[PDB]
């Protein structure tokens, strides 16, 4: 379903005004 | 993941 | 606003730049 | 931080690398 | 629509679901 | 035009946010 | 060729402007 | 699809 | 600037639209 | 080049195609 | 690891303000 | 690459 820049792109509709960390 | 949108949230700060 | 496209753009170059160590953005 | 910094001025990979963990 | 409105302000995950099917 | 950029970002979110549904994107 | 979100990112740089449905 | 170009116009408004 | 995340959507577009024959770009 | 032309208007297909090889 | 788009964009991480030609 | 982002750099002008 969600992988490489595809996951850090939904990590980014959901998060992008919160921040995150992305840590593979 | 490689989850869902609603799942996915549980990253944010 | 064009900060939020802009992020987009960002993460994107991040996890380009990052590889296996990651990152963390925080706007 | 990358926001302020790398979305007025474009950033290098340089820039952008200080935003890795 | 979602033009007007979400290229404006910064939309929601509710103000985009209204473009659904 | 940065609306018409902007419009790239709109339709990626709607394809994540709508799932199996899908969506109607019209500028 | 054209799956997930790249076949949304190809039916944007052809309609972006006319609009369009998307009906998986 | 999972087409071309110009088959996907056939999918405008 | 608006013009480098625009040269973004242009690559992408340029990937799309010429195919097997590929593309220059320089900004 | 494509910069100046195309990222001050919108580009049509045919604007886009003369940058192909 | 970089196919398609994906390969594209890379390109444009580092080559985007020299540019260059993509020749598959 | 279908390689790096380092070797890339080798097709910029
Ligand atoms: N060396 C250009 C790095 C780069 C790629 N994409 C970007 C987007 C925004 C930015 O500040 C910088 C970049
Ligand atoms: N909650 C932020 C949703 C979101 C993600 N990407 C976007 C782009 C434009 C916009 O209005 C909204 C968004
Ligand atoms: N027919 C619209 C072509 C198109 C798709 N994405 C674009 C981004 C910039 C631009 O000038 C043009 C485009
Ligand atoms: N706008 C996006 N990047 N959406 C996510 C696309 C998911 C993609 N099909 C994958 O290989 O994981
Ligand atoms: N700019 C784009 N999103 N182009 C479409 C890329 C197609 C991609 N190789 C796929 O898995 O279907
Ligand atoms: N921001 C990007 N497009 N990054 C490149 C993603 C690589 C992708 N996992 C692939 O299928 O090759
Ligand atoms: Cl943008
Ligand atoms: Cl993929
Ligand atoms: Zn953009
Ligand atoms: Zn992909």
Do not use: W
């Given at each position: 379903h969600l992988c490489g820049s595809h996951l850090v792109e939904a990590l980014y509709?959901?998060?992008?005004?919160?921040?995150?960390?992305?840590?593979? | 993941?490689?989850?869902?949108?609603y799942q996915l949230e549980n990253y944010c700060n």
């Open positions: 509709l959901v998060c992008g005004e919160r921040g995150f960390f992305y840590t593979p | 993941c490689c989850c869902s949108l």
